[PDB]
């Protein structure tokens, strides 16, 4: 079993990913660390605690992270995508289980330091907790086995605005700290996730399936699917957080390009992710020179990724 | 019925090929060359444009010297490692006899466009400083210009200055943003298009051995240009960038275009980055791409048709 920490802002697709991860036998979830984005940090914590209870694992630690990005100030949350409660306006009763005392940043440092080179981090939200861990412990990057990042848009339009994807836009400074940290990183951008979809027909197949959480998953997805229809004009949902989970377990379902990634932190392109493939020899140094490259998902085997996700979502 | 054209340029090896092509094109009337920095300093660009008019047997064609620096200021660092110290591949030719006109490139653009409203097209082959100065000085310029075809930017593709930016836009980001948001009829030909259109070493030899009026001069300039492509891009030949934008003026049917708002990043690590909003996604709230008039971005190129048209003009006797 591969040790995994999920840093997340649940969040409808985050919730699908967490429930899938609990059902994946080759994965050991050692904790959930929460962040703002789809909902405020306190809402993300409440949802993560409820997911642990729903999965029949209320002992799995939930560590609450930063309430604000690194630059400071109250974050604007995607309630128009994930609902006011962050799980598609289901307004469910509060969990009985409680979060741990330590912050998400300290939890990340402690678990990674306890098992060096063995713990993988799946980052499903803004990268604030991961960047805080990197800044507080400068050896953190070298100790984490792998960091799989759902975020960015590589030579494709963003979802916040043309320039930026939501997780990166939520904390550009944190994202730039993570991408330049020297850790073994895999980045799954919008250029990849828009290729992997669950149509309305696929969602009905889930509702009618024998899946353990099929009814709950279908109910959350109604609001999420509605946003895709209203904004993207797509009748179904894009699978973003479940695609990054697929990249943890089955990196062979993708092809990757190695290159230095930088994040724009100011101006009209705040939150923009840009990779240097290194195919052109630059005449002089630039912001991409001297950093360690990271792995950027370039292609995706769509039938293989869809098959793997459907199998986990519909497992009894 | 010849189409009036002003070429705003920083010659420049591919700029020079474009100007000589434009002079051989019968359906085109070049009413002037306006110069800017980039490949070489503005002075060098002017000297080269004057020499091109003389070489083409048209020394009466006006050359108007433009800005010596971008809108934000500062002496520009020039691409001498791409186009040579003289900007034309280190040929170091004698000075022209013809002299530039008295008026600046910005005033020339305003005057010619006001003289023939809706008839003058502008082909922009360098940083957009002169065009932006014309737009700022005269608020009717944008409506009176027939079309502005811009060689610049990189749309969902790496730049050539650095991963973020293409050279012409990076030379003056503020000017580029002024042009793209001006409301004029604009066509932008980015790096995403021009890297698809090439002349191999074999194609260059075919030009040297041709009956082209300027074949010997074009081949001589291209030696330095080709060596940069081999060193930097690893390509044995040259990309055709400025000649592709000229092809977009005369044969827009050799391309497909997407309409959308284009904004230019002016600060930070992404200074000079060009980004279009195709408008296919309904945004929840307003953003820097909201409320501007969309422009035309070249999306695909019929490579055999574009190469055939360029070769025809370069090899015309
Ligand atoms: N379209 C979108 N999808 C997901 N999260 C978002 N946050 C803001 N816009 C978003
Ligand atoms: N490859 C390139 N072509 C033109 N101008 C440049 N300036 C910097 N790199 C350049
Ligand atoms: Ca998420
Ligand atoms: Ca040029």
* DSSP code string of A45-79: HHHHHHHHHHTT-TTS-EEE--SS-TT-SPPP--H
Domain chopping of chain A, boundaries: 1-316
> For the packed helices A200-207 and A302-313, what is the interaxial angle rounded to 10 degrees?
30
Partners of B255 in beta bridges: B301
CB contact under 8 A, A162 and B275: yes
CB contact under 8 A, A288 and B162: yes
Give dist(CA A68, CA B285) in Å, integer.
21
Neighbours of A260 (CB within 10 A): 21
Give dist(CA B19, CA A313) in Å, integer.
62
Give dist(CA B288, CA B311) in Å, integer.
41
For residue B265, give the nearest of A155, A232, A267 by CB distance.
A267
Looking at the complex, report in whole angstroms how far the Cα of residue B161 sits from the nearest Cα belonging to chain A: 7
- Tell me how many degrees the CA angle A156-A161-A165 measures, rounded to the nearest 5: 60
For residue A192, CA distances in Å to A123, A246, A258, A297, A299 come to 16, 12, 15, 7, 7
For residue A282, give the nearest of B162, B263, B276 by CB distance.
B162
B72 and B175 in contact (C-beta within 8 Å)?
A: no
Nearest one of B50, B46, B62, B61 to B98, comparing CA atoms: B50
B87 and B125 in contact (C-beta within 8 Å)?
A: no
DSSP A106: H
Cite the DSSP H helix spans in chain B: 13-24, 42-55, 80-83, 105-115, 129-137, 141-144, 167-171, 173-180, 191-194, 201-208, 215-232, 242-250, 303-314
CB contact under 8 A, A268 and B265: yes
- Compute φ and ψ for B150, nearest 5 degrees: -105, 120
B17 and B243 in contact (C-beta within 8 Å)?
A: yes
Method by which the coordinates were obtained:
X-ray
- Compute φ and ψ for A26, nearest 5 degrees: -75, 0
Ligand 1 atom closest to Cα of residue A232: 1
- Compute φ and ψ for B6, nearest 5 degrees: -110, 130
Q: Say whether the peptide bond before residue B278 is cis (omega within 30 degrees of 0).
A: no
Task: List, as one string, the DSSP characters of B267-310.
Answer: SSTTTT-EEEE-S-S--SS--TTTTSPPEEEEEEE-HHHHHHHH
Task: List, as one string, the DSSP characters of A137-148.
Answer: -TTHHHHSSEEE
B82 Cα to the center of ligand 2, angstroms: 6
Residues 6+ apart with CB under 8 A from A5: A29, A30, A31, A32, A33, A107, A108, A111, A112, A119, A120, A121, A122
CB contact under 8 A, B231 and A268: no
Nearest one of A38, A42, A34, A45 to A5, comparing CA atoms: A34
Element containing residue A298 per DSSP (H, E): strand A294-300
For residue B281, give the nearest of A232, A262, A276 by CB distance.
A232
Sheet strands (E) in A113-174: 119-123, 146-150
Q: To one decimal place, what's the resolution in Å?
A: 2.0
A&B contacts, CB < 8 Å: 90
In whole angstroms, what separates CA A38 from the centre of its chain? 11
Pick from A77, A189, A268 the residue to mutate for testing the B interface (most B CBs within 10 Å): A268
Give dist(CA A16, CA A7) in Å, integer.
14
Would you call B303 an interface residue with chain A, using a CB distance cutoff of 8 Å?
A: no
B236 is an active site residue? no
For residue A140, CA distances in Å to A66, A108, A147, A283, B123 come to 18, 9, 11, 34, 53
Give dist(CA B196, CA A233) in Å, integer.
31
- What burial letters (b/e) apply to A30-67, b meaning 16+ CB within 10 Å? bbbbbbbbbbbbebbbbbbbbbbebbeebebbbbbbbe
Give dist(CA B179, CA B126) in Å, integer.
13
Polymer length in residues for chain A? 316
DSSP A38: S
Give dist(CA B21, CA B39) in Å, integer.
19
């Amino acid at each position: 079993r591969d040790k995994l920490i999920i840093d997340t802002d649940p969040g409808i697709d985050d919730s699908m990913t967490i429930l899938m991860a609990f059902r994946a036998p080759s994965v050991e979830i050692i904790g959930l660390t929460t962040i703002f984005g789809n909902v405020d940090t306190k809402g993300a914590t409440r949802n993560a605690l409820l997911l642990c209870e729903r999965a029949g694992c209320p002992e799995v630690p939930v560590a609450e992270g930063s309430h604000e990005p690194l630059k400071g100030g109250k974050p604007r949350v995607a309630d128009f995508v994930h609902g006011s409660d962050g799980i598609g306006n289901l307004f469910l009763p509060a969990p009985s289980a409680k979060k741990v005392e330590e912050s998400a940043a300290d939890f990340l440092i402690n678990k990674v330091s306890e098992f060096p080179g063995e713990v993988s981090v799946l980052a499903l939200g803004p990268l604030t907790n991961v960047a805080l861990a990197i800044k507080r412990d400068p050896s953190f990057a070298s100790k984490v086995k792998k960091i799989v990042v759902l975020g960015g848009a590589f030579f494709a339009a963003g979802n916040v605005n043309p320039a930026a994807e939501a997780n990166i836009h939520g904390d550009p400074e944190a994202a730039d700290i993570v991408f330049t940290s020297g850790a073994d990183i895999v980045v799954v951008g919008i250029n990849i996730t828009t290729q992997v979809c669950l149509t309305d027909e696929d969602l009905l197949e889930l509702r009618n399936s024998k899946g353990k959480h099929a009814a709950f998953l279908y109910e959350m997805c109604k609001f999420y699917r509605d946003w895709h229809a209203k904004s993207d004009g797509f009748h179904g949902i894009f699978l973003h957080d479940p695609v990054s989970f697929t990249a943890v377990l089955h990196p062979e379902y993708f092809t990757f390009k190695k290159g230095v990634v930088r994040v724009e932190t100011q101006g009209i392109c705040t939150g923009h992710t840009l990779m240097d493939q290194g195919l052109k020899k630059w005449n002089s140094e630039n912001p991409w020179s001297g950093y360690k490259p990271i792995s950027v998902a370039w292609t995706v085997d769509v039938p293989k990724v869809i098959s793997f996700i459907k199998k986990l979502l519909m497992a009894p």
